[PDB]
Structure formats: C-alpha cells, structure tokens
Amino acid sequence: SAKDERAREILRGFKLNWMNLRDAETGKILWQGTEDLSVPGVEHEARVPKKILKCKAVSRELNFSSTEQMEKFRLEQKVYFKGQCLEEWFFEFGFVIPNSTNTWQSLIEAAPESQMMPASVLTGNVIIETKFFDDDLLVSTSRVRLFYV
Ligand code: NI
C-alpha cells in the first residue's frame, strides 16, 4: 500500500458526530450542529447566530469517531471572504486511539478586525476550509459556507 491509501483508510472510518460553539465569556451555547461537516468533495452550509461575530472567544467542541489510529490528528482552518483568506487557524488533538469517540475542545479567539465586520456582508460570503491531517498526511479537505442569521 501507500500514504494515499492510508489517508483514505482513516477518512473511510472517520465521522464528525456533533459540534457546538459556546460564548467562552459565559459558557452559553451559541450554535449546535449534528451534520458530519468533515464529508469532503461537496460544499456544506452552517447557519450561525450573528452574535458569534461579537464574541472575543468561542469554545468549540468537535465530537468525532475514528476506526483508525492517528499519531497526531490536527486541523488547519482557513476562513475565506470573497476569495481572500482573512484568518488561518491551526489546532492539534494528537494521538487518536483506534475505534474511539472523542470530544476535541478548542478556544477560538477571532481577529478583532473580524468582530466588527457586518453580519449582512459576511453572511453567505464566508467559506471555512478545514484540512484534516495525521501529522503531515492530508486525510480530507472540507468546505462549509457560513450564514450569520
Ligand atoms: Ni505498498
């Protein structure tokens, strides 16, 4: 076999079960998703309350299942607005026990420049690109268009 086939094994056995965003200031739920937004090769949509834009810090929980072991599960997220990369995020989970279900908690501190951009301009015009890696092995690329309601 090969690295390309190993990545497909991990991808085949991977699932995002649920995700939520909390206002880190209060711990109150902003947003809750149950769609597997890790599914690649298509565009997804997420409808998020516009109040998220005025949060200095959001607490994300991603709950995921992996049939395959991963040595160093990490994410690279790029926020695109009108073709322009506004923000770059790097998150690391680390070691994933095979046949495990895990909650990955991340504090996400938005650029202050992003906090004052109007919801009416961002809505429908923002793509989050997520690259799922095992160390340097790219497992999948997923795309979610954001609406701020
Ligand atoms: Ni081989």
Expressed in angstroms and rounded, the spacing between residue 100 Cα and the centre of ligand 1 is 26
Q: How far apart are CA 76 and CA 36, in angstroms?
A: 17
**Which of 19, 47, 34, 14 has the alpha carbon at shortest distance from 104?**
19
In the reported structure, the alpha carbon of residue 2 is separated from the centroid of ligand 1 by a whole-number distance in angstroms of: 5
Buried b (16+ CB within 10 A) or exposed e, 10-47: bbeebebeebbbbbbeeeeebbebeebbbeeeeebebe
CA distance linking residue 111 with residue 53, whole number of Å: 10
Q: How far is the CA of 73 from the centre of ligand 1 (A)?
A: 22
Rounded CA gap, 44 and 137, in Å?
23
For this entry, resolution in Å reads 2.0
Output helix, strand, coil percentages for the chain, rounded to the nearest 5: 15, 60, 25
Q: Is the dihedral of CA 110, 112, 116, 117 positive or negative?
A: negative
CA distance 146 to 149: 10
Which three-class secondary structure state does DSSP give residue 23? strand
- Number of domains present in the structure of the chain: 1
Alpha carbon of 92 to ligand 1 centroid (Å): 28
- CA 78 – CA 84 distance, rounded (Å): 10
Q: How far is the CA of 4 from the centre of ligand 1 (A)?
A: 10
CB 31 within 8 A of CB 45: no
Instruction: Supply the range of the domain harboring residue 144.
Output: 1-149
Q: How many CB atoms lie within 10 A of CB 1?
A: 7
* Under 8 Å between Cβ of 110 and 56: yes
